[PDB]
């Protein structure tokens, strides 16, 4: 029994198939001009001239409602946030206020950092980000890399996101890490924005949300 549980803990010959990983970091396509079943799963607002900002606000609200329509638990306000730097005009509150008009802006080094620190082991399943290519082209995020880990010490690369034209909410469920659970299990998530569109300098963040599974008398 002792030997067998060690073997289950440490499978020597059982696991390693050929040891032939390609080792390149996998790249995710975010374009919204091609219609596919997989993209529809990750892209919610639907594929479509540039819409007017009031149309962007309208579709911003509809995407929030659609994402919240399904059986879900929102724990966006259940974690600590620490961006790389402020600009004294708008903290991350306007990023997490679920309002298109307001937004958060960083100001500092080019490799902008957004830190998400958790208090308890929460199993995130759907990662939601809203982008606005036409509304914020100057500060649009063009290159996104999402990390993972249990602590600031052991942060590791998870996925790439290249932005070409996404004027809507982006849903990011995770399946590569754990196929059995179809969800991510970490306590430490950080985001990087190393470069912007048309050689930008800073970056806004219109929306951000975290998803987890589980008449009257006045």
């Amino acid at each position: 029994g002792i030997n067998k549980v060690l073997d289950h803990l440490a499978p020597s010959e059982l696991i390693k198939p050929v040891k032939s990983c390609h080792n390149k970091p996998s790249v995710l396509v975010l374009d919204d001009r091609i219609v596919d079943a997989a993209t529809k799963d990750l892209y919610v607002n639907g594929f479509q001239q540039n819409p007017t900002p009031e149309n962007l606000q309208h579709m911003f609200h509809q995407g929030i409602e659609i994402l919240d329509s399904a059986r879900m638990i929102n724990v966006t306000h259940l974690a600590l946030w620490k961006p790389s730097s402020f600009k004294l005009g708008n903290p991350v509150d306007f990023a997490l206020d679920d309002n298109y008009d307001t937004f958060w802006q960083s100001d500092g080094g080019q490799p902008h950092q957004l830190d998400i620190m958790f208090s308890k082991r929460m199993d995130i399943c759907v990662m939601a980000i809203f982008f606005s290519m036409i509304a914020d082209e100057s500060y649009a995020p063009s290159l996104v890399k999402v990390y993972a880990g249990h602590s600031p010490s052991d942060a590791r690369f998870y996925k790439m996101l290249e932005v070409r034209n996404v004027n809507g909410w982006v849903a990011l469920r995770f399946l590569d890490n754990r196929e059995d659970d179809q969800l991510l299990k970490c306590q430490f998530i950080r985001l990087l924005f190393p470069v912007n569109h048309e050689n930008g300098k800073d970056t806004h963040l219109r929306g951000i949300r975290l998803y987890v599974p589980s008449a009257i008398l006045r």
């Binding site: 008449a215 009257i216 008398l217 006045r218």
Partner: protein, 148 residues
Amino acid sequence: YNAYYGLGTSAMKLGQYEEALLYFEKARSINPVNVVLICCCGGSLEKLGYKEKALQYYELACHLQPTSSLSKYKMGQLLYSMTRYNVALQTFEELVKLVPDDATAHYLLGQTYRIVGRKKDAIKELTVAMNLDPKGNQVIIDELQKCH
């Protein structure tokens, strides 16, 4: 009693069902003649698991107020949960007689008719529901497809 009702609701929204029920019984004791307090107390009781006592409190409420839409709504929901559809049919029939312009009543009436098996009643009530309101029509469309 308003403070007691508020304490009961505040306990209810946080999940402390037994504490909420403790508050609601006191709220009922302060004012024995009520309907919404009785409905909330019965809801708390069925949350605990006492379905029969919840039914008795609901019956007392409906006896006290023969014309109470919310009490009959809760009657129907509990009977649907308890698989007592034989009396639930007349409960929703009286309810939809009470409120003719609410699409929610038509939806539940048609759903219960479909569960019983009257296809014509189900399709008629669901068609009325689509005509009245298109906002919640997404569920109504699925109810049509399953019935058809």
